[PDB]
């Protein structure tokens, strides 16, 4: 088994390549810029963005020596060949990495809210040095031992070379994982509490304002209804309120449910209630531009009130989904909706105001929207690449075996694939937009 | 290039 | 370069295995059997010790196998043989894991006290399947491929045998990683931020009973002091005590503090008390005893009236010791203490007879010095193992080059220390004692 | 044996 040829391409390493690194190492040579001067002299969120943006400056100085290197020559000595290879395995650990932190600085802002202003502080002053760059250094140990210069073709070329493909598979696969799948796996885990978070604070809303009743309970027009507003039947039957009851969770109360069950039932109607809203020309693109809280806000009314009732606010719903806050509420504060239940309306107003449980500890609001988007963008941006030295390694395992043309396929991927990646730079500065 | 690496007489890299 | 070749040892596969094999299963089948059966029918840590404990049993029924395959031949057919590899895999990776959530569990409960009863049940209830056992199944994959029955000296053998030494050496690789380094990093992520939090509830412990002063105070004796009971200068001087803060500080202050530097400066003065405790024949065997919560108590009676004072109590001592809390506080509720200052020492006492903050939420106490005997005990085990397999797989990718005299005597010794590794079995019954 | 394997025309495994 001789080794698959493939031939270089010049189109490729005279035109593409060169023309894609500028654009990026412009874009983002400004970008990061301005981000350092800015936001470096004259929200914790923020700082993670600043180290963030620190390691991507490294790396775009380093992009005009990568596109001389695919155009000529590598005209640069060995010691700028080993520091070119060395940021970049600081940059794409250091840049993912701290995107963990930001996730896990959101899970105890909001999961653990209360008090964790002191662990929140610790991660962004001190941890983050001990678990993401001192890390990102020691993992560029083999750079600088395996970078080096190699003449080849008339020219000179700066290539990672190791001894065998032992070596080069647990790398690799070292590559995958810390590159993605672990700090991925941090990601999800602090998205999917935080969710968990977010709906229970919604049942701890209605609880106030609509009120948790265990015991059914016939309310002042007669219906039969138990916990967070749940209507169990209109009918006169006191037996019937009863055999409802029993059908919607599941076993034999005689009229009493617990607090897990209340939030249960409670979570369906809150299902529902939302799909409503996303099926109506008026509320859902309202409640799309809305933040976690102010859905929350959204969600109140259409439970007191119903879609509809909720739909007929043309004004302050106009000034909602136009980020006009004090106006909003100021329309709101003359309604029937006001008059009837005045105190409900007034927290559910300052919500909408705020944007925070001040209602519910003062002027604290915590945002995701735009930490959500950095993220995504950040995967979407790389797992091509990655999708690509997976089926690589696959091929290295020999798990799949299929000629040249395949490869051969491969190879040409990962190449567009990782050029292609480097926009992950300029996510950070753009996305102050 | 990021992957190469000795195969007996062969020089080779993974692409990349 | 043809392979090292070592000898089959008859005492070792013939003698010392199969003994160790029966010990393990012995003590274990048993020990693990009990805490089924008595903590399975008729407290959150207890939780993940029943699934730890149904990890272990499952493994422990395979030793049998395990010996007469040492001994004798693998009689047993390829359905067995490949569950036998299974249950191993299964097991080695649980097993950690569940540890590590019961470190997570500790981390929720101490740092997060206030308000982490929800997510605790959670990652107990829930999430130890979809992170614990569903991905150590998923792991086993290999196991069913490539553990199979081969036919060598006239005998049977149950090998996993894969395709080549790329995929060996990621495996295991995969196998270090997931086997201690990551679940390791959790362990001690958890670890390092609870002690940060144990010593932060001493300050606020004795911000409550000695009181926190952020500006200079002359106290009743005339004497100038700052922070918590911190005593600046004895000396009339106002200057002399505005001298000594800035010396103490670093800054230029003007008598004025901050929060933070408080504690810097009160957790300086708990190391130095802390230090008194340890080197004093009456306090250190006491301390040594108590718990993290009762150590703080026993720490702010010094504070109060220096480490001589509290070793007076020569019977509230010996009774704290012997783990007698009521007689110990029934003791200290009749000193001289206990009239000058009775409110703080009512709430000291009722610490050392509780060992929770009631006096600062009622009878909520969480021990952690049973989870790290666990823990550590667990880690002491494999750890000469894994050891042991690093430095093969050094080997495997060349980079110690030693003969084959070396080769062999790490073969050797994973074989001793794998053997010896299985009693982490029995760690988790024995342990209750 | 854990961790068996083919190198060339021998089977090694690597101990343990």
Known sequence: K??????????????????????????????????????????MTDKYRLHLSVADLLFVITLPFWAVDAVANWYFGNFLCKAVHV??????????????????????????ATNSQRPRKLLAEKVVYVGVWIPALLLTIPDFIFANVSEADDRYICDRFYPNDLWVVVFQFQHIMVGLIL?????????????????????????????????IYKDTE????????????????????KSELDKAIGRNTNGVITKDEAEKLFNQDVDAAVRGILRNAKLKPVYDSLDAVRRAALINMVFQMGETGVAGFTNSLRMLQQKRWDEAA???????????????????????????????????????????????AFFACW??????????????????????????????????????????????????? | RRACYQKXPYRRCRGX
């Open chain 1, 2 to 43: 001789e080794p698959c040829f493939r031939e270089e391409n010049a189109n490729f390493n005279k035109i593409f390549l060169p023309t894609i690194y500028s654009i990026i190492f412009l874009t983002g040579i400004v970008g990061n810029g301005l981000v350092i001067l800015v936001m470096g002299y004259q929200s």
């Open chain 1, 87 to 112: 940021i970049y395995t600081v940059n794409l650990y250091s840049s993912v990495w701290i995107l963990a932190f930001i996730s896990l600085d959101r899970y105890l802002a909001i999961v653990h």
């Open chain 1, 183 to 215: 700090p991925g796996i941090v990601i999800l885990s602090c998205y999917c509490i935080i969710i968990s978070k977010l709906s229970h604070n919604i049942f701890e809303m209605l609880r106030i304002d609509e009120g948790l009743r265990l015991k």
């Open chain 1, 222 to 241: 007669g219906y039969y209804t138990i916990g967070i507003g749940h209507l169990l039947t209109k009918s006169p039957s006191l037996n019937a309120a």
């Open chain 1, 330 to 376: 100021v329309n709101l504060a003359k309604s029937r909706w006001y008059n009837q239940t005045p105190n409900r309306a007034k927290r559910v107003i300052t919500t909408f105001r705020t944007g925070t449980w001040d209602a519910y500890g003062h002027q604290k609001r915590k945002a995701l929207k735009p930490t959500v988007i950095l993220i995504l």
């Open chain 1, 383 to 433: 797992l091509p690449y990655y999708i690509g030295i997976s089926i690589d390694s696959f091929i290295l395992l020999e798990i799949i075996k299929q000629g040249c043309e395949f490869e051969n396929t491969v190879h040409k991927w990962i190449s567009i694939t990782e050029a292609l990646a480097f926009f992950h730079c300029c996510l950070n500065p753009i996305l102050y937009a």
